[PDB]
Amino acid sequence: CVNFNFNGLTGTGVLTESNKKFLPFQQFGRDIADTTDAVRDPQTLEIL
Amino acid sequence: AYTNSFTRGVYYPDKVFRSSVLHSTQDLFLPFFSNVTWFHNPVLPFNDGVYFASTEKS
Ligand SMILES: *[C@@H]1O[C@H](CO)[C@@H](O)[C@H](O)[C@H]1NC(C)=O
Ligand SMILES: *[C@@H]1O[C@H](CO)[C@@H](O)[C@H](O)[C@H]1NC(C)=O
């Protein structure tokens, strides 16, 4: 459990290795109910 | 000249990922089945953004 602040967004949660395939230009995920779901790490090209 | 913009002019309004979702968003878009000016170097206005398209062979 970490309090995290990615490029422009901030939150609290656990970051885990993902299973999704973000596009090269996509940064922040979003669930159906307008909630942040996944992020692109600014340095490592891995989706969390 | 004029032409029909059938269903063109849709652009990702942000850098946000969404899967299997129907999202409602309001912004500047090209209205469906509207008039688009067709040219064969005139100066044009830039009121609130411009969609530009080109067919090229050379
Ligand atoms: C950012 O820098 C690190 C080392 O400081 C490097 O390993 C990484 O590949 C770099 N990322 C990009 C996208 O250049
Ligand atoms: C395009 O222009 C013609 C006449 O120039 C007009 O009859 C037509 O309604 C226009 N298209 C739209 C979608 O308004």
- Determine contact: A36 vs chain B, CB below 8 A: no
Question: What's the CA gap between A36 and B17, in Å, rounded?
Answer: 9
Query: Which residue of A6, A18, A19, A32 to mutate against B (max B Cβ within 10 Å)?
Result: A32
Question: What's the CA gap between B35 and B33, in Å, rounded?
Answer: 7
Q: How many CB atoms lie within 10 A of CB B15?
A: 13
Q: Say how many Å lie between the CA of residue B4 and the centre of ligand 2.
A: 9
Pocket lining: B4 vs ligand 2, CB cutoff 6 Å: no
Question: Which ligand is located closest to the Cα atom of residue A24?
Answer: 1
Tell me, in Å, the resolution of the deposited structure. 4.8
